[PDB]
Every structure is written in structure tokens, then in C-alpha cells.
Scaffold this motif. Structure first.
Motif, PDB file in Angstrom:
ATOM      1  N   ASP A  58     -85.850   4.686  23.903  1.00 40.20           N
ATOM      2  CA  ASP A  58     -84.434   4.587  23.631  1.00 40.20           C
ATOM      3  C   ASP A  58     -83.915   3.219  23.208  1.00 40.20           C
ATOM      4  O   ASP A  58     -82.700   3.015  23.105  1.00 40.20           O
TER       5      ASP A  58
ATOM      6  N   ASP B  45     -79.528   0.128  22.028  1.00 41.22           N
ATOM      7  CA  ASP B  45     -79.936   0.660  23.314  1.00 41.22           C
ATOM      8  C   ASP B  45     -79.106   1.924  23.585  1.00 41.22           C
ATOM      9  O   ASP B  45     -77.909   1.820  23.809  1.00 41.22           O
ATOM     10  N   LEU B  46     -79.711   3.106  23.541  1.00 43.33           N
ATOM     11  CA  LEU B  46     -78.915   4.355  23.689  1.00 43.33           C
ATOM     12  C   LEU B  46     -78.374   4.502  25.105  1.00 43.33           C
ATOM     13  O   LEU B  46     -79.066   4.185  26.064  1.00 43.33           O
ATOM     14  N   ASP B  47     -77.146   4.984  25.243  1.00 47.63           N
ATOM     15  CA  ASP B  47     -76.563   5.311  26.552  1.00 47.63           C
ATOM     16  C   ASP B  47     -77.339   6.454  27.290  1.00 47.63           C
ATOM     17  O   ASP B  47     -77.649   7.480  26.678  1.00 47.63           O
TER      18      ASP B  47
END
Ligand SMILES: Nc1nc2c(ncn2[C@H]2C[C@H](O)[C@@H](COP(=O)(O)OP(=O)(O)OP(=O)(O)O)O2)c(=O)[nH]1
Ligand SMILES: [Mg+2]
Ligand SMILES: [Mg+2]
Length: 374
Positions: free
Chosen positions: A101, A9-11
Motif C-alpha cells: 500500500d 500511502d493508502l488509507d
DNA sequence: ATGGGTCCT
DNA sequence: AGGACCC
């Protein structure tokens, strides 16, 4: 058979992409704006009370120092999104995208391959990378614990490669199924990872405070459950299946009650290339066929650039004042790449079918979609 | 809501 | 063509 699944899960994804594009914003509170909404912000703006999907008014009355960048054009975010998916596919080819994302990877075969290559000496030896959910004690003689730890090692290699090769940070969660990997990945954030050992699974599911926090239970389903007196995860676990089936139908009832116990047997699916691609714009008012044609055209020009596999269906979506749509095939001669005049002609006919142009009308959204790719 | 996506009925 | 879900 037991799986090892990772959720990545991208920031603050859009903000990350804009910060990479303009490092004059890297040490400043940043928000990515779409129309009147701050759709996301960096953790520096989050510290100052700015929240995701916050009114641009409220966000600047909370943080008067807030820098805003326009994120309406998704081009660059979509491009980076696929660079992440492609990188993950190099680890294991079955990668499932969830929006721009998030990704799921089934690490089961990779884990078994790495374990098979370890001499009995080095089984213990095996160490976690990152956080263990609920600070649970590891048992190195428990093969499930060993496989989950090797999963955490793979997850750390993936995060490292995403940083090294693409400049992106993100979270990962490792667990026995997708539901649990997605729930555990957000426990420590930003840019950290967590593994769920099986004896802590009840603790993770009962840590949720709202039934809509389970992925797969959305706005309308949570409204239904609340109408039935179901508020906590335990309420749902213990509610009558027969009543639940009657109210929500057999499919949804059976699926969500399983999810309430942390049970989810759904496979990680290879997403591959997209099934559709669409361009949208929203506005205060479209009151004119002359204006609508201009609007639709601009959306068409964007999509035609994206096109250059071919779509065999086109659809037009409106919102008056909720969505309405009309679709039809794309003529054979048109699938063969001045395409613009016959396609706008197709789309205005769809528009005219849905909108009575001899009578007043008021639109607040136009969207064109290409689907049915061959 | 914004600007996208997915699958099922 | 619409519903429901996801981000
Ligand atoms: N327009 C719109 N965009 C969204 C919505 N939800 C998510 N997005 C976009 C903008 C964000 O960068 C990204 C949000 O996905 P996430 O829920 O993972 O949030 P994000 O990565 O921003 O924050 P995070 O660090 O994961 O908590 O995708 C939404 O409901 N509407
Ligand atoms: Mg994210
Ligand atoms: Mg995101």
C-alpha cells in the motif's frame, strides 16, 4: 542534484478494499481479521480505540459493535495494489513499491518539464496543493520551494486519479528524498497531503520520539541502540561513529547515522514485476506428515493459479514450536505449463530434509515460495 | 503474531 | 539458508 520525491500511502488499505466490496460496511466500524488479529480497521473503528494488529479479543472489548471480515486471502488486496502502482507508473515510470500500500515516485524530471513550460510571468502564480509541513512560509524566489510546490501539484493529481479511477483515498508526502517524503506523508491523515520545505527538515526529524520511528531502523537495531544509551534522534546524531561502527558494523552504522540527520541518497528503484510469490498458513499444531502434505498441497494449488513468467526455484518454509527453509531448482520438464504430483514430491523431500518424521514434531507455520523467475 | 514482500551476508 | 528491514 536535488530531487523531488513523492511517497503515496493508502488509507487503511485492506479495510478500504472490503468497504468498496461491501458498502453495507462503509458507515460501520470495520476490522479486517487474520486468524486472531485485527490487522487493520477503518478510521471509524480507530475512533473507538481499535488499533492495528490488535487482538480480536481486546478489539471487541474496546468496540463490542465491531464488524469483522476475513482478510487471510490476500488475492483482492494484491490485485488492487498493482492497479495503484500501474496508475502511478503512468505519471512517471520509475515507481518503487513498499509493501502492498505504499509507493515512491521520483518526480524530478516531471517537475523540471512542467517548470520549463511555464512563462516567467506565471512563476508566482505557483501555489501549494495541501499542507506545508510546520506551516512554513513559502519563498517563491527560492527555486527549491518552487520545485517542491510543483511536486505537491503532481501529488494531488495522483491522489485524484487514484480516487477517480480506482475509488481509493490515500496520503502523500513530497520532499527532497525518500526518507523525508515517507516521514512527512503521514503528518496529516487520512486522505491528505503534506510538503516538506528544506528549512523545516530538522523540525521533522526531531519531531520523532522513538529511534525505531526512522524507516530502516527496525526491531533488532533499536534494541542495540537502546543497549548503548541511544534513545532520541539527537542521541544517535551525536553518538561516536567509531563506537557505533564497532557495535553495528560499518554498513549499518554509517547508513543509520545519516538517516538520523534526515540524509538519504538512495534512489527510487523501479520495482516492476515481483521477484517472488508465496502462500502461507499458520496454525496451532501440525504433528503429522499426512497433515503436512495436505497443507502444502493447498498452498501449492493457490500458487499454481497465481503462476498462470516461470519460477525456476521453489522453497519450503516451516516454523516449529524461528523460520527454517529448504529450496531447490524446479526441473525443466516441470517448468512447462499434472504438475501437482511431481511438485508435491519435490516439496515433501524438502520437508523430510528439514523435519525428522520418525521423531515427534510440532509445526506452527507452513509456507511455499516460488522464486528465481525468468 | 498475521500474510505477505525486499535486499544483503 | 539465514539475517535484517519494510508494509
Ligand atoms: N499481516 C500483516 N499485515 C500488515 C502488517 N503491516 C501492514 N499490513 C497490511 C494490512 C494493512 O491494510 C496494510 C498496512 O499498511 P499500513 O502500515 O500503510 O497501514 P494501513 O494502510 O492499514 O493504515 P494507515 O491508514 O496507512 O495508517 O498492509 C503487518 O505487520 N502484518
Ligand atoms: Mg497505508
Ligand atoms: Mg498498507
Amino acid at each position: 542534484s536535488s530531487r523531488v520525491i513523492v511517497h503515496v500511502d493508502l488509507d487503511c488499505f485492506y479495510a478500504q478494499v472490503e468497504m468498496i466490496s461491501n458498502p453495507e460496511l462503509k458507515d460501520k466500524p470495520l476490522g479486517v481479521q487474520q486468524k486472531y488479529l485485527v490487522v487493520t480497521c477503518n478510521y471509524e473503528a480507530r475512533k473507538l480505540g481499535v488499533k492495528k494488529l490488535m487482538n480480536v479479543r481486546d478489539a471487541k472489548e474496546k468496540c463490542p459493535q465491531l464488524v469483522l471480515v476475513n482478510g487471510e486471502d490476500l488475492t483482492r488486496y494484491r490485485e488492487m495494489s498493482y492497479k495503484v502502482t500501474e496508475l502511478l507508473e503512468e505519471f512517471s515510470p520509475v515507481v518503487e513499491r513498499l509493501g502492498f500500500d505504499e509507493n515512491f515516485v521520483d518526480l524530478t524530471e516531471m517537475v523540471e518539464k512542467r517548470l520549463q513550460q511555464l512563462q516567467s510571468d506565471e512563476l508566482s502564480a505557483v501555489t501549494v496543493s495541501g499542507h506545508v509541513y510546520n506551516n512554513q512560509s513559502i519563498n517563491l524566489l527560492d527555486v527549491l520551494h518552487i520545485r517542491l510546490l510543483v511536486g505537491s501539484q503532481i501529488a494531488a493529481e495522483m491522489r485524484e486519479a487514484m480516487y477517480n479511477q480506482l475509488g481509493l483515498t490515500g496520503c502523500a508526502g513530497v520532499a527532497s528524498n525518500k526518507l523525508l517524503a515517507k516521514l512527512v506523508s503521514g503528518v496529516f491523515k487520512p486522505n491528505q497531503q503534506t510538503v516538506l520545505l528544506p528549512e523545516s527538515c530538522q523540525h521533522l526529524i526531531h519531531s520523532l520520539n522513538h529511534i525505531k520511528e526512522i524507516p530502516g531502523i527496525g526491531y533488532k537495531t533499536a534494541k542495540c541502540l537502546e543497549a548503548l544509551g541511544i534513545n532520541s534522534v539527537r542521541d544517535l546524531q551525536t553518538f561516536s561513529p567509531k563506537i557505533l561502527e564497532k557495535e553495528l558494523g560499518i554498513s549499518v552504522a554509517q547508513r543509520i547515522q545519516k538517516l538520523s540527520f534526515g540524509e538519504d541518497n538512495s534512489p527510487v528503484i523501479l520495482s516492476g514485476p515481483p521477484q517472488s510469490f508465496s502462500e502461507e498458513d499458520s496454525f496451532k499444531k501440525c504433528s503429522s506428515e499426512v497433515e503436512a502434505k495436505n497443507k502444502i498441497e493447498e498452498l501449492l494449488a493457490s500458487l499454481l493459479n497465481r503462476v498462470c513468467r516461470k519460477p525456476h526455484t521453489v522453497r519450503l518454509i516451516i516454523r516449529r514450536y524461528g523460520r527454517e527453509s529448504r529450496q531447490c531448482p524446479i526441473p525443466s520438464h516441470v517448468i512447462q505449463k499434472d504438475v501437482m504430483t511431481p511438485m508435491v514430491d519435490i516439496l515433501m523431500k524438502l520437508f523430510r530434509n528439514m523435519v525428522n518424521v520418525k521423531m515427534p514434531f510440532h509445526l506452527t507455520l507452513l509456507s511455499v515460495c516460488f522464486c528465481n523467475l525468468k
